[PDB]
CSV table of all heavy atoms in Angstrom, one decimal:
chain,number,residue,atom,x,y,z
F,1,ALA,N,-64.3,-131.5,169.4
F,1,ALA,CA,-65.6,-131.3,170.0
F,1,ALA,C,-66.1,-132.5,170.7
F,1,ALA,O,-65.8,-133.6,170.2
F,1,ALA,CB,-66.6,-130.9,168.8
F,2,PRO,N,-66.9,-132.4,171.8
F,2,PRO,CA,-67.2,-133.6,172.6
F,2,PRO,C,-68.3,-134.4,172.1
F,2,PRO,O,-68.5,-135.6,172.5
F,2,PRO,CB,-67.5,-133.0,173.9
F,2,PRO,CG,-68.1,-131.6,173.6
F,2,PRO,CD,-67.4,-131.2,172.4
F,3,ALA,N,-69.2,-133.9,171.2
F,3,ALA,CA,-70.3,-134.7,170.7
F,3,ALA,C,-70.7,-134.1,169.4
F,3,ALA,O,-70.3,-133.0,168.9
F,3,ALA,CB,-71.4,-134.7,171.7
F,4,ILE,N,-71.6,-134.9,168.7
F,4,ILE,CA,-72.1,-134.5,167.4
F,4,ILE,C,-73.6,-134.5,167.4
F,4,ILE,O,-74.2,-135.5,167.7
F,4,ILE,CB,-71.6,-135.4,166.3
F,4,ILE,CG1,-70.1,-135.3,166.1
F,4,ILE,CG2,-72.3,-135.2,165.0
F,4,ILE,CD1,-69.7,-134.0,165.5
F,5,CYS,N,-74.2,-133.3,167.0
F,5,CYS,CA,-75.6,-133.3,166.9
F,5,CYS,C,-76.1,-133.8,165.5
F,5,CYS,O,-75.5,-133.5,164.5
F,5,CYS,CB,-76.2,-131.9,167.1
F,5,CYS,SG,-76.1,-131.2,168.7
F,6,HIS,N,-77.1,-134.6,165.5
F,6,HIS,CA,-77.7,-135.1,164.3
F,6,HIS,C,-79.2,-135.5,164.6
F,6,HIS,O,-79.4,-136.3,165.5
F,6,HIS,CB,-76.9,-136.4,163.8
F,6,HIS,CG,-77.5,-136.9,162.5
F,6,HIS,ND1,-78.0,-138.2,162.4
F,6,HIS,CD2,-77.6,-136.3,161.3
F,6,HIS,CE1,-78.3,-138.4,161.1
F,6,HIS,NE2,-78.1,-137.3,160.4
F,7,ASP,N,-80.1,-134.9,163.8
F,7,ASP,CA,-81.5,-135.1,164.0
F,7,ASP,C,-82.0,-134.8,165.4
F,7,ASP,O,-82.9,-135.4,165.9
F,7,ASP,CB,-81.9,-136.6,163.6
F,7,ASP,CG,-82.2,-136.7,162.2
F,7,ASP,OD1,-82.0,-135.7,161.4
F,7,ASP,OD2,-82.7,-137.8,161.8
F,8,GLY,N,-81.3,-133.9,166.1
F,8,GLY,CA,-81.6,-133.6,167.4
F,8,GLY,C,-80.9,-134.5,168.5
F,8,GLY,O,-80.8,-134.1,169.6
F,9,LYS,N,-80.5,-135.7,168.1
F,9,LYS,CA,-79.8,-136.6,169.0
F,9,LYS,C,-78.3,-136.2,169.1
F,9,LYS,O,-77.8,-135.4,168.3
F,9,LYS,CB,-79.9,-138.0,168.4
F,9,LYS,CG,-81.3,-138.5,168.3
F,9,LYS,CD,-81.3,-140.0,167.8
F,9,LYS,CE,-80.8,-140.0,166.4
F,9,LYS,NZ,-81.8,-139.4,165.5
F,10,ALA,N,-77.7,-136.6,170.1
F,10,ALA,CA,-76.3,-136.4,170.4
F,10,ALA,C,-75.5,-137.7,170.2
F,10,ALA,O,-75.9,-138.7,170.8
F,10,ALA,CB,-76.0,-135.8,171.8
F,11,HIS,N,-74.5,-137.7,169.4
F,11,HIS,CA,-73.6,-138.9,169.2
F,11,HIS,C,-72.3,-138.7,169.9
F,11,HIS,O,-71.7,-137.7,169.7
F,11,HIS,CB,-73.4,-139.2,167.7
F,11,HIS,CG,-74.7,-139.5,167.0
F,11,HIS,ND1,-75.1,-140.7,166.7
F,11,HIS,CD2,-75.6,-138.6,166.5
F,11,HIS,CE1,-76.3,-140.7,166.0
F,11,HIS,NE2,-76.6,-139.4,165.9
F,12,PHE,N,-71.9,-139.7,170.6
F,12,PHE,CA,-70.6,-139.8,171.3
F,12,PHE,C,-69.7,-140.9,170.7
F,12,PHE,O,-70.3,-141.9,170.2
F,12,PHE,CB,-70.7,-140.1,172.8
F,12,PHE,CG,-71.5,-139.0,173.5
F,12,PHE,CD1,-72.9,-139.0,173.4
F,12,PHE,CD2,-70.9,-138.1,174.3
F,12,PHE,CE1,-73.6,-138.1,174.1
F,12,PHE,CE2,-71.6,-137.2,175.0
F,12,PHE,CZ,-73.0,-137.2,174.9
F,13,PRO,N,-68.4,-140.9,170.7
F,13,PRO,CA,-67.6,-141.9,170.1
F,13,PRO,C,-67.5,-143.1,171.0
F,13,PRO,O,-67.3,-143.0,172.2
F,13,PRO,CB,-66.3,-141.2,169.9
F,13,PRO,CG,-66.2,-140.3,171.0
F,13,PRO,CD,-67.6,-139.8,171.4
F,14,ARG,N,-67.6,-144.3,170.4
F,14,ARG,CA,-67.4,-145.5,171.2
F,14,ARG,C,-66.0,-145.6,171.8
F,14,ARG,O,-65.8,-145.5,173.0
F,14,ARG,CB,-67.6,-146.8,170.3
F,14,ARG,CG,-69.0,-147.1,170.0
F,14,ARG,CD,-69.2,-148.5,169.4
F,14,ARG,NE,-70.5,-148.7,168.9
F,14,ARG,CZ,-71.5,-149.2,169.7
F,14,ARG,NH1,-71.3,-149.4,171.0
F,14,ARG,NH2,-72.7,-149.4,169.2
F,15,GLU,N,-65.0,-145.6,170.9
F,15,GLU,CA,-63.6,-145.5,171.4
F,15,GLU,C,-62.9,-144.6,170.3
F,15,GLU,O,-62.8,-145.0,169.2
F,15,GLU,CB,-62.9,-146.8,171.5
F,15,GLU,CG,-61.5,-146.7,172.0
F,15,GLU,CD,-61.3,-145.5,173.0
F,15,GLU,OE1,-61.7,-145.7,174.2
F,15,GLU,OE2,-60.8,-144.5,172.6
F,16,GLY,N,-62.4,-143.5,170.8
F,16,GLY,CA,-61.7,-142.5,169.9
F,16,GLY,C,-62.0,-141.1,170.3
F,16,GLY,O,-62.3,-140.8,171.5
F,17,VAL,N,-61.9,-140.2,169.4
F,17,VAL,CA,-62.1,-138.8,169.6
F,17,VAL,C,-62.4,-138.1,168.3
F,17,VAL,O,-61.9,-138.6,167.2
F,17,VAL,CB,-60.8,-138.2,170.3
F,17,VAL,CG1,-59.6,-138.4,169.4
F,17,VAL,CG2,-61.0,-136.7,170.6
F,18,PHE,N,-63.2,-137.1,168.3
F,18,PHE,CA,-63.5,-136.3,167.1
F,18,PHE,C,-62.5,-135.3,166.8
F,18,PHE,O,-62.0,-134.6,167.7
F,18,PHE,CB,-64.9,-135.6,167.3
F,18,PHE,CG,-66.0,-136.6,167.4
F,18,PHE,CD1,-66.6,-136.9,168.6
F,18,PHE,CD2,-66.6,-137.1,166.3
F,18,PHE,CE1,-67.6,-137.8,168.7
F,18,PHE,CE2,-67.7,-138.0,166.4
F,18,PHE,CZ,-68.2,-138.3,167.6
F,19,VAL,N,-62.1,-135.2,165.5
F,19,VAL,CA,-61.1,-134.2,165.1
F,19,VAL,C,-61.6,-133.6,163.8
F,19,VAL,O,-62.5,-134.1,163.2
F,19,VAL,CB,-59.7,-134.8,164.9
F,19,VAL,CG1,-59.2,-135.4,166.2
F,19,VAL,CG2,-59.7,-135.8,163.8
F,20,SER,N,-61.0,-132.6,163.4
F,20,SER,CA,-61.3,-131.9,162.1
F,20,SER,C,-60.1,-131.1,161.6
F,20,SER,O,-59.5,-130.4,162.4
F,20,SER,CB,-62.5,-131.0,162.2
F,20,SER,OG,-62.1,-129.8,162.7
F,21,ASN,N,-59.7,-131.3,160.3
F,21,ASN,CA,-58.6,-130.6,159.8
F,21,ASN,C,-59.0,-129.2,159.3
F,21,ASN,O,-58.1,-128.4,158.9
F,21,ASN,CB,-58.0,-131.3,158.6
F,21,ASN,CG,-59.0,-131.6,157.5
F,21,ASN,OD1,-60.2,-131.4,157.7
F,21,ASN,ND2,-58.5,-132.0,156.3
F,22,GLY,N,-60.3,-128.8,159.4
F,22,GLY,CA,-60.7,-127.5,159.0
F,22,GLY,C,-62.0,-127.5,158.3
F,22,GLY,O,-62.8,-126.5,158.3
F,23,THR,N,-62.3,-128.6,157.6
F,23,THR,CA,-63.5,-128.7,156.8
F,23,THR,C,-64.3,-129.9,157.1
F,23,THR,O,-65.6,-129.9,157.1
F,23,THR,CB,-63.1,-128.7,155.3
F,23,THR,OG1,-62.1,-127.7,155.1
F,23,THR,CG2,-64.3,-128.4,154.5
F,24,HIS,N,-63.7,-131.1,157.3
F,24,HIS,CA,-64.4,-132.3,157.6
F,24,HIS,C,-64.1,-132.9,158.9
F,24,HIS,O,-63.0,-132.6,159.5
F,24,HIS,CB,-64.1,-133.3,156.5
F,24,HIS,CG,-64.2,-132.8,155.1
F,24,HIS,ND1,-63.4,-131.9,154.5
F,24,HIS,CD2,-65.1,-133.1,154.1
F,24,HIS,CE1,-63.7,-131.6,153.3
F,24,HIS,NE2,-64.8,-132.3,153.0
F,25,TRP,N,-65.0,-133.7,159.5
F,25,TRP,CA,-64.8,-134.3,160.8
F,25,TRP,C,-64.6,-135.8,160.7
F,25,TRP,O,-65.2,-136.5,159.9
F,25,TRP,CB,-66.0,-133.9,161.7
F,25,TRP,CG,-66.1,-132.5,162.2
F,25,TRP,CD1,-66.5,-131.4,161.5
F,25,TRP,CD2,-65.6,-132.1,163.4
F,25,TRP,NE1,-66.4,-130.3,162.3
F,25,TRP,CE2,-65.8,-130.7,163.5
F,25,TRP,CE3,-65.0,-132.7,164.5
F,25,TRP,CZ2,-65.5,-129.9,164.6
F,25,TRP,CZ3,-64.7,-132.0,165.6
F,25,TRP,CH2,-64.9,-130.6,165.6
F,26,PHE,N,-63.7,-136.3,161.6
F,26,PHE,CA,-63.4,-137.7,161.6
F,26,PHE,C,-63.3,-138.1,163.1
F,26,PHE,O,-63.2,-137.4,164.0
F,26,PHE,CB,-62.0,-138.0,160.9
F,26,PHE,CG,-61.9,-137.4,159.5
F,26,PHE,CD1,-61.0,-136.5,159.2
F,26,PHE,CD2,-62.8,-137.9,158.6
F,26,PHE,CE1,-60.9,-136.0,157.9
F,26,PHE,CE2,-62.7,-137.4,157.3
F,26,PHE,CZ,-61.8,-136.4,157.0
F,27,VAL,N,-63.3,-139.5,163.2
F,27,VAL,CA,-63.0,-140.1,164.5
F,27,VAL,C,-61.7,-140.8,164.4
F,27,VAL,O,-61.5,-141.6,163.5
F,27,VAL,CB,-64.2,-141.1,164.9
F,27,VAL,CG1,-65.4,-140.3,165.3
F,27,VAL,CG2,-64.5,-142.0,163.8
F,28,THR,N,-60.8,-140.6,165.4
F,28,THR,CA,-59.5,-141.3,165.4
F,28,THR,C,-59.3,-141.9,166.8
F,28,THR,O,-59.9,-141.5,167.8
F,28,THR,CB,-58.4,-140.4,165.1
F,28,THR,OG1,-58.1,-139.6,166.3
F,28,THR,CG2,-58.8,-139.4,164.0
F,29,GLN,N,-58.4,-142.9,166.8
F,29,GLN,CA,-57.9,-143.5,168.0
F,29,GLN,C,-57.0,-142.4,168.7
F,29,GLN,O,-56.4,-141.5,168.0
F,29,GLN,CB,-57.2,-144.8,167.8
F,29,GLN,CG,-56.1,-144.7,166.7
F,29,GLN,CD,-55.6,-146.1,166.5
F,29,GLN,OE1,-55.8,-147.1,167.2
F,29,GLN,NE2,-54.8,-146.2,165.4
F,30,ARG,N,-56.8,-142.6,170.0
F,30,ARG,CA,-56.2,-141.5,170.8
F,30,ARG,C,-54.7,-141.4,170.5
F,30,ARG,O,-54.1,-140.4,170.4
F,30,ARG,CB,-56.5,-141.6,172.2
F,30,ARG,CG,-58.0,-141.3,172.5
F,30,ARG,CD,-58.5,-142.0,173.7
F,30,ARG,NE,-60.0,-142.0,173.8
F,30,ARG,CZ,-60.7,-142.4,174.8
F,30,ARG,NH1,-60.1,-142.8,175.9
F,30,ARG,NH2,-62.0,-142.3,174.7
F,31,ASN,N,-54.0,-142.6,170.5
F,31,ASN,CA,-52.6,-142.6,170.5
F,31,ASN,C,-51.9,-142.7,169.2
F,31,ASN,O,-50.7,-142.8,169.1
F,31,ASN,CB,-52.1,-143.8,171.4
F,31,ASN,CG,-52.1,-143.5,172.8
F,31,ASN,OD1,-51.4,-142.7,173.3
F,31,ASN,ND2,-53.0,-144.2,173.6
F,32,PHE,N,-52.7,-142.6,168.1
F,32,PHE,CA,-52.1,-142.6,166.7
F,32,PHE,C,-53.1,-141.9,165.8
F,32,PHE,O,-54.3,-141.9,166.1
F,32,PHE,CB,-51.9,-144.0,166.3
F,32,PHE,CG,-51.0,-144.2,165.1
F,32,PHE,CD1,-49.6,-144.2,165.2
F,32,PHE,CD2,-51.5,-144.3,163.8
F,32,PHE,CE1,-48.8,-144.3,164.1
F,32,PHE,CE2,-50.7,-144.4,162.7
F,32,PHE,CZ,-49.3,-144.4,162.9
F,33,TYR,N,-52.6,-141.3,164.8
F,33,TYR,CA,-53.5,-140.6,163.8
F,33,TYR,C,-53.9,-141.5,162.8
F,33,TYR,O,-53.1,-142.0,162.0
F,33,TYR,CB,-52.7,-139.4,163.2
F,33,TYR,CG,-53.6,-138.5,162.4
F,33,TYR,CD1,-54.8,-138.0,162.9
F,33,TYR,CD2,-53.3,-138.3,161.1
F,33,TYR,CE1,-55.6,-137.3,162.1
F,33,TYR,CE2,-54.1,-137.5,160.3
F,33,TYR,CZ,-55.3,-137.0,160.8
F,33,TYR,OH,-56.1,-136.2,160.0
F,34,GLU,N,-55.3,-141.8,162.7
F,34,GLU,CA,-55.9,-142.6,161.7
F,34,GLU,C,-57.3,-142.2,161.5
F,34,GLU,O,-58.2,-142.8,162.1
F,34,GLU,CB,-55.8,-144.1,162.1
F,34,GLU,CG,-56.2,-145.1,161.0
F,34,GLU,CD,-55.7,-146.5,161.3
F,34,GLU,OE1,-54.8,-146.6,162.2
F,34,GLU,OE2,-56.1,-147.4,160.5
F,35,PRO,N,-57.5,-141.2,160.7
F,35,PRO,CA,-58.9,-140.6,160.5
F,35,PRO,C,-59.8,-141.6,159.9
F,35,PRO,O,-59.4,-142.4,159.0
F,35,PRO,CB,-58.6,-139.4,159.7
F,35,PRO,CG,-57.4,-139.7,158.9
F,35,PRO,CD,-56.6,-140.6,159.8
F,36,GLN,N,-61.1,-141.6,160.3
F,36,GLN,CA,-62.1,-142.5,159.7
F,36,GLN,C,-63.4,-141.7,159.6
F,36,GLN,O,-63.7,-140.8,160.4
F,36,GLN,CB,-62.3,-143.7,160.5
F,36,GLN,CG,-61.1,-144.6,160.5
F,36,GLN,CD,-61.3,-145.8,161.4
F,36,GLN,OE1,-62.3,-145.9,162.1
F,36,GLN,NE2,-60.3,-146.8,161.4
F,37,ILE,N,-64.2,-142.1,158.7
F,37,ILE,CA,-65.5,-141.4,158.5
F,37,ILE,C,-66.4,-141.8,159.6
F,37,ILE,O,-66.4,-143.0,160.1
F,37,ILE,CB,-66.1,-141.8,157.1
F,37,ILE,CG1,-65.2,-141.3,156.0
F,37,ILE,CG2,-67.5,-141.2,157.0
F,37,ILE,CD1,-65.7,-141.7,154.6
F,38,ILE,N,-67.2,-140.8,160.1
F,38,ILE,CA,-68.1,-141.1,161.2
F,38,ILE,C,-69.3,-141.9,160.7
F,38,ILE,O,-69.9,-141.5,159.7
F,38,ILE,CB,-68.6,-139.8,161.8
F,38,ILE,CG1,-67.4,-139.0,162.4
F,38,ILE,CG2,-69.5,-140.1,163.0
F,38,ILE,CD1,-67.7,-137.6,162.8
F,39,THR,N,-69.6,-143.0,161.4
F,39,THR,CA,-70.7,-143.9,161.0
F,39,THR,C,-71.5,-144.2,162.2
F,39,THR,O,-71.0,-144.1,163.4
F,39,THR,CB,-70.2,-145.1,160.3
F,39,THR,OG1,-69.3,-144.7,159.2
F,39,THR,CG2,-71.3,-145.9,159.7
F,40,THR,N,-72.7,-144.7,162.1
F,40,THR,CA,-73.6,-145.0,163.2
F,40,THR,C,-73.1,-146.2,164.0
F,40,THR,O,-73.8,-146.6,164.9
F,40,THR,CB,-75.0,-145.2,162.7
F,40,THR,OG1,-75.9,-145.1,163.8
F,40,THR,CG2,-75.1,-146.6,162.1
F,41,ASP,N,-72.0,-146.8,163.6
F,41,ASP,CA,-71.5,-148.0,164.3
F,41,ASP,C,-70.3,-147.8,165.3
F,41,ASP,O,-70.2,-148.6,166.2
F,41,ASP,CB,-71.1,-149.1,163.3
F,41,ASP,CG,-70.0,-148.7,162.4
F,41,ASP,OD1,-69.6,-147.5,162.5
F,41,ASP,OD2,-69.6,-149.5,161.6
F,42,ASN,N,-69.6,-146.7,165.0
F,42,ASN,CA,-68.5,-146.3,166.0
F,42,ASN,C,-69.0,-145.2,166.9
F,42,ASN,O,-68.1,-144.7,167.6
F,42,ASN,CB,-67.2,-146.0,165.3
F,42,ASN,CG,-67.4,-145.0,164.2
F,42,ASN,OD1,-68.5,-144.4,164.0
F,42,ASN,ND2,-66.4,-144.8,163.3
F,43,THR,N,-70.2,-144.9,166.9
F,43,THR,CA,-70.8,-143.8,167.8
F,43,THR,C,-72.0,-144.4,168.4
F,43,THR,O,-72.8,-145.2,167.8
F,43,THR,CB,-71.1,-142.6,167.0
F,43,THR,OG1,-72.1,-142.9,166.0
F,43,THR,CG2,-69.9,-142.0,166.3
F,44,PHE,N,-72.3,-143.9,169.6
F,44,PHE,CA,-73.6,-144.3,170.3
F,44,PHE,C,-74.3,-143.0,170.8
F,44,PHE,O,-73.7,-141.9,171.0
F,44,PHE,CB,-73.3,-145.2,171.5
F,44,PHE,CG,-72.6,-144.5,172.7
F,44,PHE,CD1,-73.4,-143.9,173.7
F,44,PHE,CD2,-71.3,-144.5,172.9
F,44,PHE,CE1,-72.8,-143.3,174.8
F,44,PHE,CE2,-70.7,-143.9,173.9
F,44,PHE,CZ,-71.4,-143.3,174.9
F,45,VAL,N,-75.6,-143.1,170.9
F,45,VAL,CA,-76.5,-142.0,171.1
F,45,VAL,C,-76.9,-142.0,172.6
F,45,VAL,O,-77.1,-143.0,173.3
F,45,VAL,CB,-77.8,-142.1,170.2
F,45,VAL,CG1,-78.7,-141.0,170.4
F,45,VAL,CG2,-77.3,-142.3,168.8
F,46,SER,N,-77.2,-140.8,173.1
F,46,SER,CA,-77.7,-140.6,174.5
F,46,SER,C,-78.4,-139.3,174.6
F,46,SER,O,-77.8,-138.2,174.7
F,46,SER,CB,-76.6,-140.7,175.5
F,46,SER,OG,-75.9,-139.5,175.6
F,47,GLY,N,-79.8,-139.3,174.5
F,47,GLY,CA,-80.5,-138.1,174.7
F,47,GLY,C,-80.5,-137.2,173.5
F,47,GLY,O,-80.0,-137.5,172.4
F,48,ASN,N,-81.0,-136.0,173.7
F,48,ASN,CA,-80.9,-134.9,172.7
F,48,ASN,C,-79.9,-133.8,173.1
F,48,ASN,O,-79.6,-133.7,174.3
F,48,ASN,CB,-82.3,-134.3,172.5
F,48,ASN,CG,-82.7,-133.4,173.7
F,48,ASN,OD1,-82.5,-133.7,174.9
F,48,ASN,ND2,-83.3,-132.2,173.4
């Protein structure tokens, strides 16, 4: 998915991509699988 809604805001990944195995969502680097919990520091906001 290209963005994450939260509190009406849209979060985009700083460097990485959003993935989900079916139940939970993570941000990973593009060229290797390394899932990480989404936090307000590896994502940036732009508009609603």
Side-chain angles (χ1 to χ4, degrees):
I4 292 290
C5 289
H6 182 241
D7 271 8
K9 299 181 291 294
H11 298 261
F12 302 76
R14 285 192 186 277
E15 181 34 78
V17 61
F18 293 100
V19 301
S20 80
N21 59 348
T23 316
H24 309 71
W25 282 85
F26 307 118
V27 286
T28 80
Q29 51 187 350
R30 286 151 201 194
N31 278 295
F32 197 84
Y33 186 54
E34 189 159 351
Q36 293 177 356
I37 296 174
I38 301 170
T39 309
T40 198
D41 61 357
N42 50 12
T43 62
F44 73 88
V45 182
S46 82
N48 74 318

